[PDB]
Design a protein around this ligand. Structure first.
Ligand SMILES: NC(=O)C1=CN([C@@H]2O[C@H](COP(=O)(O)OP(=O)(O)OC[C@H]3O[C@@H](n4cnc5c(N)ncnc54)[C@H](OP(=O)(O)O)[C@@H]3O)[C@@H](O)[C@H]2O)C=CC1
Ligand SMILES: CCCCCCCCCCCCCC(=O)SCCNC(=O)CCNC(=O)[C@@H](O)C(C)(C)COP(=O)(O)O
Ligand code: SF4
Ligand code: SF4
Ligand code: SF4
Ligand SMILES: [Zn+2]
Lengths: 156, 48, 95, 146, 114, 176, 297, 208
């Protein structure tokens, strides 16, 4: 049909523009911040993918939770998540953000940031390398590329 | 590996698969152990 | 050496498979149950028994330091082979 | 080595008889209601209880007080001890009064009607230790067991 | 049995300090309901303050109630100076926690805890 | 054995004062900084073309975990639980039993990859080189429980990456 | 009862509640809070979703790992319904649209899909089935919503004879279309009498209907403790929210009075204290700010 | 014992023993023990009423001049009735030396704050309040420093469990991060590692 073709091409356009202009807000909590900074450093250079370095939280498209989430900061994480405009994504970077990690059995650590915010990409490592984080960001772009917002809207 | 080939084994995958996450072929975890306690099955005949 | 339950589910090399009335099969709906189809119990049976001319044999698994710790296997029983407790290779005195 | 029977043949859920007379799984509410509805219709010797060989003192006094609320004194064990004479009134006529340790202090042990090697194997091991170190004299009235 | 005091020489000075801490919390509850924009009433927050004070009402040691007044002053300073968020104030109201079985029979039904 | 950073007295003759005033009024060090930024403008950047170009790794690299085999197909793991004893984050969960040929083998070998600190104490505690931490670092998932590897997943990582893992161990086993 | 579905733990996130729930329509207003209250017990929750997977992200922190299983389903595909319900011990229906669409009218959403779900849940061996009708459901109703929902209630009752059918009156909450409709309309005042019910009361009633074996085959009516006229209720909405998308079917439903059904059980028969509007309307309408309470009848 | 054994420093042992005698006899009102370890570290174990007079001495005396507070530490030892052991690591830059000043308290006896001697202590003993519950009298702003704001319990006490008593999660009903009792999906596996054989006969305690 014509309408299905039109909403498919518009889905492809808006998914292209969203995955090719991802703006991150990095929670530089712990040691994974150093490796996000290496993913911004000139060897890997996220800025050539259209992924800018340190966009403000009220204009960013993806929240990279890079470090250990403690109990004292989990409401601040959730408040910054609630202040992000949609579509917002969450990359969980490294073991403490993924599942608690080396501080999993601690009294003061949230056992993974997925107890606090919905998470799209889990990037494993302690820390994951800057290349592994850039792999996770390209996998997030591939996840955005196969979104079907207007096709489901046309089929609802 | 054209110059120094890898050592061939009967269990090394002939078909390398890429990252299957987000597909129907992704990894789903489960407990690989069997049942620990055995339950008592009552008899299928009546007790009269 | 994988077989299949009547539910259609592959039994793992441990022997694990969910029951039919077990709800935990729902995790594989639309997805797959990843099993390894190279059973080590079926592959170590395929090895030939090494006929040696000695009474005590040593096994390290091959490769020198890339194998297991070097153990010594007695071969006095002519009824049964002498199996390495690490790698599963088995040995027979040739007399 | 009997701990592997502790994970086989286990009772895990309450069972009641259905309309076909077969045991079927149920809840604790339904099972305790169906037992208590019959227990309220009992009085005196209408209800009795047999204690098994593996029952702790807490469940024993629990079921004793429960049947004493119905005024039932018929509470039994599987193992017969004779009630003639003193019975279970004095403790001394149903105990190992000497001790397990006091076997080390005896000089003649008389064993009547028992195979203590299997009925109480470490009591027999203590008798053997006193046999070996104290030159204990042992006699047995019964079948000539090892 | 001669111990060094924290603030109170006896229990009457201790009750004076308990009383002044309760006065400060009682005054603070409407401001706490307002600026944290809570979903509770001022009366319900004062009920929670009274519940937390009555929870410790069996202590007879002056040093223990001196530490209780010190910790209450610390929680009060964390409430007045807006250092707690809304979540720390609402943790006194165990709202998402399902009510536990209290009698014998429901604890028998749910599991093994006495 | 020590030196004084910033303990210089500037010269007060008219030459040096006029040098400092030409610096102040004519912005000489600001043009120096613009010159250094212009100098990096005309350099070749250090940017590799990921994913087509890859960061250089060593054979010691500690990435994704893999249970290995012998050159007969028999799995190397003989269920000794040294890896989970040494595991600093308690990521390794092991259950074992004698299997049908009487061999000491695991029935559970789980690694929570979100507890794992990727320090490789398991592969150096392992007496038979069964668990290794292989060279894969590109294994990001979309779901948390996809990073909860059981024995099937780890044996499949071994079968997947063994041609590379064996060569890395061949490079580094004389340092171990 | 299977050993993996015996309840364990202390009723928390890592516990096992023994509830395997397939919640159709879980991405809506009721499904949000029902999956939040199921997954906080340690329940296996199958969420069959129609929409974009992004639009299901908020359901993911609601339970422990592996406790929420997302899968695709189509309403006109019985195979996807069987694929979703065949491991569950309870199936909850929450499929609803306030408005009819080009591909789904009120009969597809309220008659065809609930009868399909209940038929497949009967022929898959599911123990418990909960369906959600409306309190004002009637064949002789002026709105097409209430007519098709009464028809669908009748068909659910006749094809799953042990279905717990639940009648909420007008559910108010943070994501409702009852207080948020009146707070964003800025349609008129008539003789309509309503008793709205709070969403957490509805969710606690649904979970108590899951846990109660006496709720099989019952028809509950979830209403609030206070009945209001429509006019002073709308004036209370505008007074709390500090103020001085629709169709004609929604207008017919707002101008339809909430009926009194004393012969049907309610929230008190499931152990639920119905929360009044005066505690929760400030929590709902705090978003709408840039009060004497409404008179009850 | 040359290659693998640590070389013993006898000169520092003799000098720190002489200075420990020096401090023990200048301040006999508070000094309880003086010990020097085999790796030459001096410990002055004092009475807790002499926190200020001893630390003011070592900071200000012309033969001590321990001007730097390296670290301030508590240790929970529950078998002692004074279970908390407060440790003052001090550095003299003039004599290039380190000293340790150790005292004790239980849960209820306050220790005098040493912010008047070392301002560095302002956070350290503040942390000893947060982690151990040791109250410090006349501290300028004594409150918690590391735990969450509603945190009950003093975590580095050894009767406090490893995972706590509560855990957080976001709850979408109340739209808020909430605290619940902790349930672990995998329990922390306690390992009993200690060998049943005596490792160090020099540390053998006399039996009962
Ligand atoms: N005040 C109220 O809301 C009241 C509601 N009810 C009933 O309760 C139920 C839930 O209400 P509510 O949360 O407000 O409704 P919503 O509109 O918020 O959500 C209903 C859900 O049904 C799904 N759905 C709708 N149409 C279809 C379809 N054709 N095929 C598949 N899925 C579909 C939607 O999925 P998706 O996100 O993909 O669109 C959504 O998840 C409804 O049945 C409603 O009639 C009863 C009384 C009062
Ligand atoms: C909004 C939420 C905020 C919650 C506020 C939390 C405050 C927590 C502070 C806790 C401080 C205390 O509880 S110290 C109280 C302990 N006191 C005692 O043990 C001494 C006994 N005290 C009493 O009986 C007190 O009622 C009185 C008033 C001192 C005397 O009453 P009795 O006479 O009859
Ligand atoms: S995953 Fe590891 S390196 Fe990363 S922040 Fe956590 S502790 Fe630091
Ligand atoms: S790399 Fe370290 S943390 Fe990871 S499984 Fe091995 S020992 Fe455990
Ligand atoms: S992987 Fe190695 S260390 Fe771990 S149990 Fe197996 S053989 Fe032992
Ligand atoms: Zn071998």
């Amino acid at each position: 049909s014509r309408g299905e073709y039109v909403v498919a091409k518009l889905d492809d356009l808006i998914n292209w523009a969203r995955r090719s202009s991802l703006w991150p807000m990095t929670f530089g909590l712990a040691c994974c911040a150093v490796e996000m900074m290496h993913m911004a450093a000139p060897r890997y250079d996220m800025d050539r993918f259209g992924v800018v370095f340190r966009a403000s939280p009220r204009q960013s498209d993806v929240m990279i939770v890079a470090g250990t989430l403690t109990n004292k900061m989990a409401p601040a994480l959730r408040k910054v998540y609630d202040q992000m405009p949609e579509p917002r994504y969450v990359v969980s970077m490294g073991s403490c953000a993924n599942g608690g990690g080396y501080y999993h059995y601690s009294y003061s650590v949230v056992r993974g940031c997925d107890r606090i915010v919905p998470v799209d990409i889990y990037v494993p490592g302690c820390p994951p390398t800057a290349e592994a984080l850039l792999y996770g960001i390209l996998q997030l772009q591939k996840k955005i590329k196969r979104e079907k917002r207007l096709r489901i809207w046309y089929r609802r | 590996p054209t110059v120094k080939p890898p050592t061939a084994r009967k269990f090394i995958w002939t078909n390398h698969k890429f990252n299957l996450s987000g597909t129907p072929q992704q990894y789903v975890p489960y407990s690989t152990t069997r049942k620990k306690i055995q339950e008592w099955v009552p008899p299928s005949t009546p007790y009269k | 050496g994988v077989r299949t339950s009547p539910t259609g589910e592959k039994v793992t090399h441990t022997g694990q498979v969910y029951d039919d009335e077990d709800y935990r099969r729902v995790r594989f709906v639309g997805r797959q149950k990843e099993v390894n189809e190279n059973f080590a119990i079926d592959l170590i049976a395929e090895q030939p028994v090494s006929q040696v001319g000695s009474r005590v044999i040593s096994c390290d698994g091959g490769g020198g330091a890339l194998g297991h710790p070097r153990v010594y296997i007695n071969l006095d029983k002519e009824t049964k082979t002498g199996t390495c407790g690490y790698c599963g290779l088995q040995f027979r005195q040739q007399h | 080595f009997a701990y592997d029977g502790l994970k086989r043949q286990r009772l895990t859920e309450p069972m009641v008889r259905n309309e076909k007379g077969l045991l079927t799984h149920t809840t604790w509410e339904d099972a305790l209601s169906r037992v208590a509805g019959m227990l309220q219709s009992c009085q005196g010797n209408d209800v009795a209880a047999i204690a098994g060989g593996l029952v702790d003192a807490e469940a024993l006094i629990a079921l004793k007080d429960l049947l004493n609320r119905v005024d039932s004194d018929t509470l039994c064990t599987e193992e017969v001890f004779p009630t003639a004479g003193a019975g279970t009134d004095l403790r001394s006529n149903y105990l190992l009064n000497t001790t397990i340790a006091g076997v080390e202090e005896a000089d003649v042990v008389l064993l009547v009607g028992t195979n203590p090697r299997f009925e109480a194997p470490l009591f027999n091991a203590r008798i053997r230790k006193s046999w070996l170190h104290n030159d204990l004299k042992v006699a047995l009235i019964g079948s000539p067991v090892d | 049995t001669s111990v060094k005091p924290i603030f109170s020489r006896d229990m009457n000075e201790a009750k004076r300090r308990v009383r002044e801490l309760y006065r400060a919390w009682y005054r603070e509850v409407p401001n706490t309901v307002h600026l944290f924009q809570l979903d509770i009433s001022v009366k319900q927050g004062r009920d929670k303050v009274r519940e937390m004070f009555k929870k410790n009402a069996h202590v007879t040691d002056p040093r223990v109630v001196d530490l209780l007044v010190i910790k209450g002053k610390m929680e009060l300073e964390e409430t007045i100076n807006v250092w707690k968020q809304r979540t720390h104030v609402m943790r006194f109201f165990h709202e998402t926690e399902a009510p536990r079985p209290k009698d014998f029979l429901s604890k028998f039904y749910v599991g093994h805890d006495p | 054995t020590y030196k004084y950073v910033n303990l210089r007295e500037p010269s007060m003759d008219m030459k040096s004062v006029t040098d400092r005033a030409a610096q102040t009024l004519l912005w000489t060090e600001l043009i120096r900084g613009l010159g250094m930024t212009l100098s990096y403008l005309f350099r070749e950047p250090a940017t590799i073309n990921y994913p087509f170009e890859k960061g250089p790794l060593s054979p010691r690299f500690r990435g994704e975990h893999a249970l290995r085999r012998y050159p007969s197909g028999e799995e190397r793991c003989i269920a000794c639980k040294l890896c989970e004893a040494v595991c600093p984050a308690q990521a390794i969960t092991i259950e074992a039993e004698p299997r049908a040929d009487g061999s000491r083998r695991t029935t559970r070998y789980d690694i929570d990859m979100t507890k794992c600190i990727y320090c490789g104490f398991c592969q150096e505690a392992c007496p038979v080189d069964a668990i290794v931490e292989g060279p894969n670092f590109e294994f990001s998932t979309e779901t948390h429980e996809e990073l909860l590897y059981n024995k099937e997943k780890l044996l499949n990582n071994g079968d997947k990456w063994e041609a590379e893992i064996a060569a890395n161990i061949q490079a580094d086993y004389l340092y171990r | 009862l299977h050993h993996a579905v015996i309840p364990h733990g202390k009723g928390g996130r890592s516990s096992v509640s023994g509830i395997v729930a397939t919640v159709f329509g879980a991405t809506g207003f009721l499904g949000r809070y029902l999956v939040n209250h199921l997954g906080r017990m340690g329940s296996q929750v199958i969420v069959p979703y129609r929409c974009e997977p992004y639009d299901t992200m908020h359901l993911r922190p609601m339970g422990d790992l592996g406790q929420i299983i997302f899968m695709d389903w189509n309403g006109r595909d019985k195979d996807s319904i069987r694929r979703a319900v065949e491991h569950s011990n309870v199936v909850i229906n929450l499929v609803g649209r306030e408005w009819e669409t080009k591909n789904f009218d009120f009969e597809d959403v309220f008659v065809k899909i609930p009868q399909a779900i209940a038929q497949v849940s009967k022929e898959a061996g599911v123990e418990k089935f909960i369906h959600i009708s409306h309190l004002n459901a009637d064949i002789k109703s002026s709105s097409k919503y209430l007519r098709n929902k009464a028809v669908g209630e009748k068909e659910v009752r006749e094809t799953f004879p042990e279905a717990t059918i639940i009648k909420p009156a007008d559910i108010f909450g943070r994501e409702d279309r009852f207080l948020n409709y009146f707070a964003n309309i800025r349609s008129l005042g008539k003789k309509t009498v309503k008793q709205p019910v709070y969403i957490v009361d509805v969710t606690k009633g649904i979970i108590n209907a899951i846990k109660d074996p006496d709720a099989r085959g019952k028809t509950f009516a979830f209403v609030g403790p206070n009945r209001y006229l429509l006019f002073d209720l709308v004036q209370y909405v505008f007074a709390v929210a500090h103020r001085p998308w629709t169709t004609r079917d929604k207008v017919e439903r707002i101008h339809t009075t909430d009926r009194t059904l004393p012969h049907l059980p309610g929230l008190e028969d499931l152990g639920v204290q119905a929360t009044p509007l005066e505690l929760k309307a400030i929590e709902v309408l705090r978003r709408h700010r840039t009060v004497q309470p409404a008179k009850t009848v | 014992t040359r290659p693998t054994v640590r070389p013993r420093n006898d000169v520092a042992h003799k000098q720190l023993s002489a200075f420990g005698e020096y401090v023990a006899e200048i301040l006999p009102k508070y000094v309880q023990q003086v010990q020097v370890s085999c790796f030459s570290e001096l410990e002055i174990c004092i009475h807790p009423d002499g926190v200020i007079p001893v630390l003011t001495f070592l900071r200000d005396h012309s033969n001590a001049q321990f001007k730097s507070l390296a670290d301030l530490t508590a240790v929970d030892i529950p078998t002692r009735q004074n279970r908390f052991e407060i440790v003052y690591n001090l550095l003299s830059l003039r004599f290039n030396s380190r000293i340790r000043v150790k005292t004790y308290t239980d849960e209820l006896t306050p220790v005098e704050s040493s912010v008047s001697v070392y301002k560095a202590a302002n956070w350290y003993e503040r942390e000893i309040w947060d982690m151990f519950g040791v109250f410090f009298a006349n501290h300028p702003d004594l409150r918690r420093i590391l735990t969450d704001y509603g945190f009950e319990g003093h975590p580095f006490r050894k009767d406090f469990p490893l995972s706590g008593y509560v855990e957080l999660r976001y709850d979408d009903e109340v739209k808020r991060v909430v605290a619940e009792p902790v349930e672990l999906a995998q329990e922390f596996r306690k390992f009993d590692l200690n060998s049943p054989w005596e490792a160090f006969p020099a540390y053998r305690q006399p039996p009962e």
